[PDB]
């Protein structure tokens, strides 16, 4: 059985915050929500990673870029197109670049462009725009049990939090809100907000990661932001053996969640938040007239509920269950 | 008197043809309408060209790139996105890129990331839809004076031409179809289809830069699939004074009819066609509270018809310029 396609998601790498803590001072030397020199990285690497995989081990893509053997689609933010060009420079790394006249680079050092295209702004594919995403929260998840149990929990700490981050503190939402900049304070070496301290920037930090994935916990939540995504993914594998398509991978640059959101709707959520340049794969395999696909998520492969104690199944049968969440949402 | 903004639109660079002469086998070594290396370099040392115009020379943009600095927007080709990617590794170069750690490269050869945003593919901003440009044509230009005396003179080849090549030429569109393969022919040095004279290929090569031009000589045609990229470049403008905006440089990536709408849009229509890598620069200039504009087309400056000796004018007057020809269509 050999790999003859695959389809990727990515979260993007390391960035600037959304916005600030009112009651610190924090420079973060990149403007807000852009990708950091870090990202850039950690994309980087994460190319360089795919490349020993699917280059180097599976001998799915070629050493030098074909065109049009990739489909790069973005998100309409620049951090997640610079996250997808970071990666292809470490998936199609200087030096591998076309050559012009006697052996010259086309471009100094041997520079790959390879295009990406990105998706309108109001798109709801890869990310759900987010008063449409906060409106699904309202009416979905934020009166659930288990948001009002943890709400309950954390509630007797709003009041401190919010004095001493001055920002706006009266529920989980804006826990995971602050939450955000402590993450993004802590990735940078960033000391603690004045008055807050390692103890109380754990549990918001844990509680924003609960949060974030807890909303996932729920595969109609899932289904309405990211039904529309897996399905196309799982299409792209079918082009791969009906004819209609010739690349040998799809890849979508996304967002921590477009990887919770289809997870969620594979009915295999995940337990902690997507941290930067997270990644999934959907590897499809052939051996003549068998079609066998796996997924894989951060390295790992993940077990499908029907898939077998190789965590693998048949793309006949990967139709049926996605044919049958679909009936269901 | 400062440089303050600069508006720029781009045509790709070299690429493979879209189609076939049928009677010929050509190889191209790059799959149909994509960039070619020879396209890759093209851009590539443009971008170096502008680097030494906008960094070096005027100072407007600094050394190393700034975040939020430049928004650059390219129409939903592979090769449009490919060549500003390409432009961009020649303005801001390998070893000019962002760097971690101690002084340690985010990613190898100091490479620069720079978002490209793409518009979709039914948007007629700077890619005028295929089938509605066609449309324009057949309504405006097909049936001009101009277009039925040239076709009259062409006319007595078409037999012979289609004889040779294979393809269908019953009028100027076809020539233009067949124009452009010859085009790429000899920009790749190969050899003429069997039984086309040198003088031959010349001739539908003329016939080809003449239509093109042709087609934007109506201002109303021009209008029709320009107007709205041109009050677009022309409000950037605005948005550098009003403190709407913050970039230095908007530019557009887009094709050979991109220049040719703008152009003609202006009342400036081009003579010839634009060949590759070929651009357009609206500049801005700020001296305390007088805003002035110039116009430069492949390296050299335009003359407005509002424009002084100096082929400069009020950013006011071209304002009132623009919006005249609003009123006038
Ligand atoms: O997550 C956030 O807060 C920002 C707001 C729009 C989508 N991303
Ligand atoms: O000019 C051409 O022929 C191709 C067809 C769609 C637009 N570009």
Chains 1, 2 share one sequence.
């Not at 950690?42 to 990673?49: F, I, K, S, V």
């Not at 209609?244 to 979508?252: A, E, Q």
């Amino acid at each position: 059985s050999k790999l003859i396609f695959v389809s990727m998601i990515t979260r993007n790498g390391d960035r600037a915050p959304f916005a600030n803590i009112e009651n610190a001072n924090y420079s973060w030397g990149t403007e807000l929500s852009e990708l950091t020199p870090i990202g850039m990285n950690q994309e980087y690497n994460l190319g360089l990673q795919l490349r020993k995989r699917y280059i180097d081990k599976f001998g799915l893509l070629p050493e030098h870029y074909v065109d049009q053997s990739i489909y790069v689609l973005s998100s309409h933010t620049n951090r997640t197109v610079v996250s997808a060009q970071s990666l292809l420079m470490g998936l199609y790394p200087a030096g591998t670049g076309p050559l012009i006249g006697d052996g010259d680079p086309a471009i100094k050092d041997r520079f790959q462009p390879i295009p990406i295209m990105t998706l309108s702004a109001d798109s709801r594919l890869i990310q759900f725009p987010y008063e449409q995403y906060l409106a699904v929260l309202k009416k979905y998840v934020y009166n659930s049990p288990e948001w009002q149990n943890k709400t309950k929990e954390a509630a007797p700490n709003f009041a401190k939090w919010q004095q001493i981050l001055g920002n706006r503190i009266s529920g989980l939402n804006d826990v995971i809100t602050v939450g955000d900049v402590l993450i993004v304070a802590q990735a940078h070496g960033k000391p603690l907000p004045k008055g807050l301290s390692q103890e109380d920037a754990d549990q918001i930090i844990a509680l924003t990661d609960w949060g974030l994935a807890q909303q996932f916990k729920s595969q109609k939540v899932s289904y309405i932001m990211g039904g529309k995504l897996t399905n196309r993914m799982i299409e792209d594998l079918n082009n791969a053996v009906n004819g209609k398509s010739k690349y040998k991978m799809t890849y979508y640059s996304g967002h921590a969640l477009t990887l919770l959101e289809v997870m969620g709707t594979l009915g295999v959520p995940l337990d902690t938040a997507p941290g930067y340049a997270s990644n999934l794969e959907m590897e499809l395999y052939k051996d003549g007239d068998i079609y066998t696909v796996k997924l894989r998520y951060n390295g790992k492969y993940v077990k499908l509920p029907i898939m077998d104690k190789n965590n693998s199944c048949s793309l006949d049968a990967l139709n049926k269950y996605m044919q049958s969440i679909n009936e269901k949402f």
